[PDB]
Design a protein around this nucleic acid. Structure first.
Lengths: 167, 111, 127, 197, 48, 106
RNA sequence: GAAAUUGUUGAAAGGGAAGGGCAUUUGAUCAGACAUGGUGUUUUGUAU
RNA sequence: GGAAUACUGCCAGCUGGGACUGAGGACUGCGACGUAAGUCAAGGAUGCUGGCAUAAUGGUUAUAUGCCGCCCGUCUUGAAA
RNA sequence: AGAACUGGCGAUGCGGGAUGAACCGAACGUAGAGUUAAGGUGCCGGAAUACACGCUCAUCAGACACCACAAAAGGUGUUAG
RNA sequence: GCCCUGAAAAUGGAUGGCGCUCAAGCGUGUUACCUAUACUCUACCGUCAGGGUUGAUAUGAUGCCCUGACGAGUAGGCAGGCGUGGAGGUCAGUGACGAAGCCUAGACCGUAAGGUCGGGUCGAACGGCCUCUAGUGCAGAUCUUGGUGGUAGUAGCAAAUA
RNA sequence: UUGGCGGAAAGGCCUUGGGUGCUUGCUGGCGAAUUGCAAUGUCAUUUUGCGUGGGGAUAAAUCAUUUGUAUACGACUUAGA
C-alpha cells in the first residue's frame, strides 16, 4: 500500500438544514412609480426610450408598453430599479390589463442540442398589443406634444447634471 | 482617562448594546434577563433594567452589580474627538480629565 | 459527486520561497527561516517577503480537499481500491507513479465499476 | 468635458497657475498655455532677478553640461515650475507632461481658439493692490532670453489681424441681436419665456 | 531664424554640383535636372 | 439624435492611499458635475464600467468591460470611492469611466 | 549523466544596475465542474 | 404683558439612500401578534430570475503600471556602512 | 565622563517627524467593513486655493517640538500700548 | 509684536522639492475632511482555560462537541512535526508491460519543513505504515577537494645590429 | 467651381456659382416585438501587408583603389568609366 489508511472515514450522508426564518413579504414600490406614469428605460434594447407604465407584476417587475405604434416598444416587463419615473402622468383608467401575469411571458426554454449555427412571433401577443394600444393611443392625443415626446428618445446632453435635474 | 457624570440615556444604551456579564471568568453577552437573574438574582436583580437601576441609583449592591459587568469595549467616536490634540486637559482644549456632563456626548459616539 | 462543502478559501496561494533564492543559485527555494541578527525579512520590514505562520492555516472543514471536493488517496492495486468502496463521495484515488502500464488498466476498470473517481486516469495510455 | 483647454498666460501667477495645470494633466486633461512671456510673479523685479541668479549659480562642478540646466525662455520658467510639481521621473508623470504645451505669444491654430483664464491664479484677484510684481518677459530677457522683440512684433501683428475679426463679429452679432428681438414678443416667444428660455 | 525658401540658378556648373556627390565618376549626374525643368517657362515656379 | 449617452462621465484619479502606501482594492473616481459631498450622495450605489479595448477578440468582441459600484463619498469636493470586481490596473489613472444611472431611486 | 559555465533556436523586457512585496491589465499556458438519479419507457441489441 | 426662536438635552418617534457580512445546519430557548388553529424581522439567508456551461471565472507564468523594498552572515549600545 | 527614579532601544515591526535605534501615536495571527491617534488637507500627495479676526514686504523674509543654532546693541519701517 | 541692521568659509543645493506675498508666512478661533498592524463588529487559524458526552450501530473517550479569552520578540527553554543512511515486523506492497536517479515558468495537497501526480531520459532494484538506531539536514568558517566564469581574444608574445 | 486672405509651427479661414441629398417649420399613413427583466452590447482613429485598377520618375551610397589640407584605429579631405 502506498497509503496505509485513515482510521475514521467521515460519514458521507448529508445532514438536513435548519429551519430558516426568512418570510417573503410583498415588495413596496417607491411612490414615483404609479400606473400610467411615463418611464425612461436605462438598460436593454430600448434604453433611452420613454415608455408608459401600466401594471406591477407578481415577480417584482413592471408591465410596460411603448405604445408599440408610437415608439416600437412592445408589451414587456422591466425591473423597477432599471427605469426612471418621470413626472409626466397620464391616465390608464379603462385599459384591460388583468390578463397579463408572470406566466404570460414564457420563454419556452430550448434544449442545448438545438445549437444556433447561423440563425416567429406569436399570434396572440400582437392581438393583445393593439387592444391595449387602442385604449391608450386615443387617450395620448388629449394632451398636446405627448406622442412626439413618447416617440422621441431620451439622452444626456453636455452640461446636464442628473443629481440636479428633475426627471 | 476621560471621566464624567453619565445620564440615564447613556447608561441604558451602554448596558443594552455593549452589555456583557462576567460568568465563571467568561465574557457572556446578556441578550436576556434569565442569566442576569442567575448570577445577580441573590441581590434582588432580576432584569436588565434592575441592573441599570443599581447603577444610576447607587444601591447597596453597586459593587457586586458593577463587577458583574465586563469592562465596556468601546469604539472610537463616530464623529471624532472634536479636538486637534487629545492628550491635554479638557479645560485646555484637549480630551483627558473631567468633562463633567460632556462625557455623554463622547460615550454615545463611541458606543 | 462530492459531499456538500463550503467554498474553499486559502488566505494565501503564493508559494513561500526562501529569501535570496532569486539572488544565489546555492540558496534553494525550500523555505528557511532567517535566524540572522539584521535580516530585514526576520524583522518584518515593509516591502519584504512574508513568512509562513499559523494564521494562514486552512479552514478545518475545507482542509485537505481537492478542488473537485474529494480528499486524495494513493492506491497501488485493486485491493487498495475497495478501501474506498463506501466513501466514493469523500475520497478520490491516485494511481501511484510506479504502477506498471498494464496494471493501471485493471485498476481503472474496477474504479469505474465501483464509481470511484481517479484523479489521474491518463498515466501510460497508448494512442 | 473639453478636449484641449487653451489658457491665456497674461496676468496669471506662475506658481498658482502651475499648481492648477499640474493637477489637470495628472487627471488626464490636455492643457495648452499661450502668452507665457507675460505671466506674473509676486515680488518686485529685483527680488525675483536675484532668485534666478541664485539658481543660476548651481551647476555640476566637475562637468557643467550635466548639471541643472537653466532655461531662459519664459515658457521654460513656467515649465520648470510645473515639472517640479509632478512626479516627472515616473511613467505616469511623463505621460502627464505630454499633455502640456507652453508657448510665448499665441502661435497658430491656438490663435483661432477660445482662451480661458483661471480666476484662482489671476494676479488682479490674488495680489493685494499696491503689491509689486514682475513680468516674465522682462525677467527672462534679463537672464538671457533673446526673442522678446520678435514675439512682440508677431503679437502686434496678431492683434491687428484679430481686430477686424471682432469688428466683423460685433457687427454680425448686432444683426442677430436685432432680428430675434423683432422675432420676440410672438406667440412662440412667450411660450419660451414661460419655460425659462 | 529659419529659412523658408531656396531658389537656384538655371545652369549649375559641373564643379559646383560635384559638391553634391561622393562618387562623381559613376553617376548619371542627375543634379537639378528636374529643377531646371522648372525654368523654360515665363513665371511658372521661379518668382512665385 | 447627435448624442446617445445614458451614463455620467468620470475619471479614475488614483487608489486609496496614504502618503507612502496605496490600497488597490479601493479606487477614487471623479464624477463630472459633482463638486460637494451632497451631490455625490445621489451617485452612491450606481454601477461603474471601465470600457477598454484589446486586440484579441474573446467571445465576439474586442471590447472588454470592468464592472464596479460607488460605495461612499471621499473628501469635500465630490470625489467618490468605488470598488470593482477586479481592481483597475493603475495604468488608467486619468482614464474615463462610465457611471450609470441604475439602480435608480427616482 | 545534476549544477556552475557555454552555443543555436523560440518568447519577452531593457533612457545611469538587476532582482523583490501588494494589486490589477495584457500575452502565453493549464487543472477542476460540467450527466445526479429522474417522472419515464415517444425505446432499440427487449430487458438494455 | 403675552409669545416665538436660538442653545442644550430626551424619545422603548417615523422614515429614505449607500456599503461590508450570510458564519451555523432536524427540534429544544427567550419572545411578539392573535379567544384559536397559526403566523413572525423571535438561539446566524432565503425567494424569484438571466447569461454561460466555456479558458468565461480562476490558478500559474512573463511583462507593464501605481506605491513600497539598501546585502546576507557575525562582533556590537549602535551595520546599508 | 559619572550617579537617582521612571519610561524606552537592545530584543520591535507599524502610522507621523522628508531622511534617523531611542521622539510623537500605537506595539504585531490571516482577512473584510467602520472610526480614529500622531500628523496633516496649493501640486508632488489621500484630504477645504475652507471660514473668521489681525500682523509682516525682507537688494541674506518666514514657515512648527526632540532637530539640525544665533546674541548684546539699535531703527520717525509698521502696529498696539 | 512682525520686519530690518548687527549676520564672514570654502564642489552646486536645500522650510523635503516646486513654489507661495489680504500667503501656500506668523498669532489665534470654528468646522469639514485624509488614514496605522491601533479601537469596534464578523469570519478563519492556533494556543490557553472552563465544561458536556460509555448509549446502542460503526470502528479515534489520546474522539466528538459547547463556551470564553488570548497571539510582538534577540539570547534562551520546552512542545508538536518534516526529511536522510541502516535494523525488527507488516502491506503474500511497487518493478524489465520498466525500480532508482535526473530534467520539466505542467497539475494537486500542507502555514511550513515537505508529499503526490503527469511528460521526457533511463536501465534493476525500491517504497507506505508501527517501532529501533545514528558518521542524520549547510550559504558562509581568508572552510576541504574537484570543476567553472567575468576580466578577455585582454596584458602580452619589443635585450643579444638582419 | 470662382476669388482672395493667413509663414510664429502658415496646412487653415472667408467667399461666387450651379448640382445633389436631407429638413422635426407644420400636418398624415406603414414598420419596430423574441436581445425574452440588465450585461460597452461593439458605430471612434493609428500603423502595417497582400490583392485590386488608375496615374507618375527611371538614383545613389558603402567597401575595394587613390590623396594628404587628415590621422593611433575609426573618422576626415581628394581623385578615378
Amino acid at each position: 500500500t502506498a497509503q496505509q489508511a485513515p482510521k475514521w472515514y467521515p460519514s458521507e450522508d448529508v445532514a438536513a438544514p435548519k429551519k430558516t426564518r426568512k418570510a417573503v413579504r410583498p415588495q413596496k414600490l417607491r411612490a414615483s412609480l404609479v400606473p400610467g406614469t411615463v418611464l425612461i428605460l436605462l438598460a436593454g434594447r430600448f434604453r433611452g426610450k420613454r415608455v408608459v407604465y401600466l401594471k406591477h407584476l407578481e415577480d417584482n417587475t413592471l408591465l410596460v408598453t411603448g405604445p408599440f405604434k408610437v415608439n416600437g416598444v412592445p408589451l414587456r416587463r422591466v425591473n423597477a430599479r432599471y427605469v426612471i419615473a418621470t413626472s409626466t402622468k397620464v391616465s390608464v383608467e379603462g385599459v384591460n390589463v388583468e390578463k397579463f401575469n408572470v406566466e404570460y411571458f414564457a420563454k419556452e426554454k430550448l434544449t442545448k442540442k438545438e445549437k444556433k449555427e447561423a440563425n416567429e412571433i406569436k399570434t396572440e401577443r400582437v392581438e393583445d398589443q393593439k387592444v391595449v394600444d387602442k385604449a391608450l393611443i386615443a387617450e395620448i392625443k388629449k394632451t398636446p406634444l405627448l406622442k412626439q415626446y413618447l416617440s422621441a428618445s431620451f439622452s444626456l446632453k453636455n452640461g446636464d447634471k442628473p443629481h440636479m435635474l428633475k426627471f | 482617562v476621560a471621566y464624567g457624570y453619565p445620564s440615564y440615556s447613556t447608561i441604558r444604551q451602554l448596558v443594552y448594546k455593549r452589555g456583557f456579564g462576567k460568568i465563571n471568568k467568561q465574557r457572556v453577552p446578556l441578550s436576556d434577563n434569565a442569566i442576569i437573574e442567575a448570577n445577580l438574582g441573590k441581590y434582588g436583580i432580576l432584569s436588565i433594567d434592575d441592573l441599570i437601576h443599581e447603577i444610576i441609583t447607587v444601591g447597596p449592591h453597586f459593587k457586586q452589580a458593577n463587577n458583574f459587568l465586563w469592562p465596556f469595549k468601546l469604539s472610537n467616536p463616530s464623529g471624532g474627538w472634536g479636538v486637534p490634540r487629545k492628550f491635554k486637559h479638557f479645560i485646555q482644549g484637549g480630551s483627558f480629565g473631567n468633562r463633567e456632563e460632556f462625557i455623554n456626548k463622547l460615550v454615545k459616539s463611541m458606543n | 459527486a462530492s459531499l456538500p462543502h463550503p467554498k474553499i478559501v486559502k488566505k494565501h496561494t503564493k508559494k513561500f520561497k526562501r529569501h535570496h533564492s532569486d539572488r544565489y543559485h546555492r540558496v534553494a527555494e525550500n523555505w528557511r527561516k532567517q535566524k540572522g541578527i539584521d535580516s530585514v525579512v526576520r524583522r518584518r520590514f515593509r516591502g519584504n517577503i512574508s513568512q509562513p505562520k499559523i494564521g494562514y492555516g486552512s479552514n478545518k472543514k475545507t482542509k485537505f480537499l481537492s478542488p473537485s471536493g474529494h480528499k486524495t488517496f494513493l492506491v497501488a492495486n485493486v485491493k487498495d481500491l475497495e478501501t474506498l468502496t463506501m466513501h466514493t463521495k469523500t475520497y478520490a484515488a491516485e494511481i501511484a507513479h510506479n504502477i506498471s502500464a498494464k496494471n493501471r488498466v485493471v485498476i481503472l476498470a474496477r474504479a469505474k465499476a465501483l464509481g470511484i473517481k481517479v484523479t489521474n486516469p491518463k498515466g501510460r495510455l497508448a494512442l | 468635458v473639453e478636449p484641449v483647454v487653451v489658457i491665456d498666460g497674461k496676468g496669471h501667477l506662475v506658481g498658482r497657475l502651475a499648481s492648477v495645470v499640474a493637477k489637470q494633466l495628472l487627471n488626464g486633461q490636455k492643457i495648452v498655455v499661450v502668452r507665457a512671456e507675460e505671466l506674473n510673479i509676486s515680488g518686485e523685479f529685483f527680488r525675483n532677478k536675484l532668485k534666478y541668479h541664485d539658481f543660476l549659480r548651481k551647476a555640476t562642478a566637475f562637468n557643467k553640461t550635466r548639471g541643472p540646466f537653466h532655461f531662459r525662455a519664459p515658457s521654460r520658467i513656467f515649465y520648470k515650475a510645473l515639472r517640479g510639481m509632478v512626479s516627472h521621473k515616473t511613467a505616469r508623470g511623463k505621460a502627464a507632461l505630454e499633455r502640456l504645451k507652453v508657448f510665448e505669444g499665441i502661435p497658430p491654430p491656438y490663435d483661432k481658439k477660445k482662451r480661458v483664464v483661471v480666476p484662482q491664479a489671476l494676479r488682479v484677484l490674488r495680489l493685494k493692490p499696491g503689491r509689486k510684481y514682475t513680468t516674465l518677459g522682462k525677467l527672462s530677457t534679463s537672464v538671457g532670453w533673446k526673442y522678446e522683440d520678435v514675439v512682440a512684433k508677431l503679437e502686434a501683428k496678431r492683434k491687428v489681424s484679430s481686430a477686424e475679426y471682432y469688428a466683423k463679429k460685433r457687427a454680425f452679432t448686432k444683426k442677430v441681436a436685432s432680428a430675434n428681438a423683432t422675432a420676440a414678443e410672438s406667440d412662440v416667444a412667450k411660450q419660451l419665456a414661460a419655460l425659462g428660455y | 531664424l529659419r529659412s523658408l525658401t531656396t531658389v537656384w540658378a538655371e545652369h549649375l556648373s559641373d564643379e559646383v554640383k560635384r559638391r553634391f556627390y561622393k562618387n562623381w565618376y559613376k553617376s548619371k549626374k542627375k543634379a537639378f535636372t528636374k529643377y531646371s525643368a522648372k525654368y523654360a517657362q515665363d513665371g511658372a515656379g521661379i518668382e512665385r | 439624435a447627435e448624442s446617445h449617452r445614458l451614463y455620467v462621465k468620470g475619471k479614475h484619479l488614483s487608489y486609496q492611499r496614504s502618503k507612502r502606501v496605496n490600497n488597490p482594492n479601493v479606487s477614487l473616481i471623479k464624477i463630472e458635475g459633482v463638486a460637494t459631498p451632497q451631490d455625490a450622495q445621489f451617485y452612491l450605489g450606481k454601477r461603474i464600467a471601465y470600457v477598454y479595448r484589446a486586440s484579441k477578440e474573446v467571445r465576439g468582441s474586442k471590447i472588454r468591460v470592468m464592472w464596479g459600484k460607488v460605495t461612499r463619498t471621499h473628501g469635500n469636493s465630490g470625489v467618490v470611492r468605488a470598488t470593482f470586481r477586479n481592481n483597475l490596473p493603475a495604468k488608467t489613472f486619468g482614464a474615463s469611466v462610465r457611471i450609470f444611472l441604475y439602480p435608480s431611486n427616482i
